[PDB]
Design a protein around this ligand. Structure first.
Ligand SMILES: c1ccc([P+](c2ccccc2)(c2ccccc2)c2ccccc2)cc1
Lengths: 103, 89, 102, 89
C-alpha cells in the first residue's frame, strides 16, 4: 500500500515539473497554481509513505521513475533526445545514484 | 493580447476603479502591475501590482481635475503590449 | 550559464531539506524561514534553468548532484559515511554529469 | 524549556502588557499563543497568537480589580511546559 502512495507522489511531481515548464517562469496563472498544487500533493503522499517505509527504497524508486516519466513527457510535449553527447549519461547518473543509496 | 479593454468603472475625484478583460483560461497571468502618474510628466510614475486572477484594481488618492495616465502591464512583454489609458477626474 | 543555475538550485534544496531536518514541525522560526527562502529560491531557479536544458536532462543532473552534495555534506560535517565502498558511486554520478555537460 | 520569563510590564486596570525572553538567534520559534482568562473560571479563557520573532504582547479589554491567569504556549509541547502567571489589575 505505501508503494502506491509513492508512485502517486512520484507522478504528482512528474506532472508539476512538466507544468512548471509551462508556467513561463511562474508568470502564467493556472500552470503556476498547478505546480504549487502538485508539489503539495506529492509532499503529502511522501509523508504518508515514508512515515514508515525506508527512505532509500522510496528515493531510488522516485529518482528513477521520475527520471523516466518526466523525460518521456519532455519528449512527449517536445523531444530533444540526447542534445548533448549521451542520454546514457542520465542512465548512468541513475546508476551511480542507486549504489550510494542501496549499496 | 492580454490584457484587453482597460476601462474606468467608477471615478471619484480622488479614486479610479479600473477593470480589464483579463483574458481566458490559458492567457491568465499570475499578476498585473498597474502604473498611474501625472499626465504631464512633472513627476515619476506610481506603481502597484495586483494578483493575476483579479481583473479589476482600485487606484486611490489622486488630485481632482488633473488628467492621469493609467497603464496595465503583464509579467513579461511576451503577452502583448501594455494597454494604457487616460482619464480626467 | 544554464548549468550554473541548475547547480545553484541544487545547493538551495540541499540546504533547504537540511534546515528542515533541523527545525521541528516548521516551528523553529529561523531555520524554517531558511527553508522557505531556500525552497522558494530553488523553485524559481529550476523554472528558469528548465527553458534551456530539457526537463529529463536537468532532472537527471538534479537528482545526481543532489545526493552528491547531500552525502558529501553528510560526511563532511555530520559524519556517517556509511557504506564507505560507495565513493565509487559518487564518481559514477560525476561521469554521467560530464557526458551530458557542454 | 521555552519560552521563559513571562511578566507584566505595564498594567492598567483594563490592560496587561506582557513580555517574555525569546531566547537567542538560533532558537526562535515561529509563533507563541497567549491565554488570558479570569482566575476563577466563570467563562472560557481568551486566546490569540503572536509572531515568534516578537517577545512582547499587550492584552486589552479586561475588567478592573480582577485577577487573571495568563498562560503562554509554544507551538508544540516539545519546547516545554507552558509558562503561566497571575496578576491583579
Ligand atoms: C525546491 C525544493 C525541492 C525541489 P525537489 C526536485 C526534484 C527533482 C527535480 C526537480 C526538483 C527535491 C526534493 C528532495 C531532494 C532533492 C530535490 C521536489 C519537490 C517536491 C516534491 C518532490 C521533489 C525543488 C526545488
Amino acid at each position: 500500500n505505501p508503494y502506491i502512495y509513492l508512485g502517486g507522489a512520484i507522478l504528482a511531481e512528474v506532472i508539476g515539473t512538466t507544468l512548471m515548464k509551462f508556467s513561463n517562469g511562474f508568470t502564467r496563472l493556472i500552470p503556476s497554481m498547478g505546480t504549487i498544487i502538485c508539489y503539495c500533493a506529492s509532499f503529502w503522499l511522501l509523508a504518508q509513505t515514508l512515515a514508515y517505509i525506508p527512505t532509500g527504497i522510496a528515493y531510488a524508486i522516485w529518482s528513477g521513475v521520475g527520471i523516466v516519466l518526466i523525460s518521456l513527457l519532455s519528449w512527449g510535449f517536445f523531444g530533444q533526445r540526447l542534445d548533448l553527447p549521451a542520454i546514457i549519461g542520465m542512465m548512468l547518473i541513475c546508476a551511480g545514484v542507486l549504489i550510494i543509496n542501496l549499496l | 493580447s492580454v490584457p484587453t479593454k482597460l476601462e474606468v468603472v467608477a471615478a471619484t475625484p480622488t479614486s479610479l476603479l479600473i477593470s480589464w478583460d483579463a483574458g481566458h483560461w490559458w492567457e491568465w497571468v499570475t499578476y498585473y502591475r498597474i502604473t498611474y502618474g501625472e499626465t504631464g510628466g512633472n513627476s515619476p510614475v506610481q506603481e502597484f501590482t495586483v494578483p493575476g486572477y483579479s481583473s479589476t484594481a482600485t487606484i486611490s488618492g489622486l488630485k481632482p481635475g488633473v488628467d492621469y495616465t493609467i497603464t496595465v502591464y503583464a509579467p513579461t512583454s511576451d503577452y502583448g503590449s501594455p494597454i494604457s489609458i487616460n482619464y480626467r477626474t
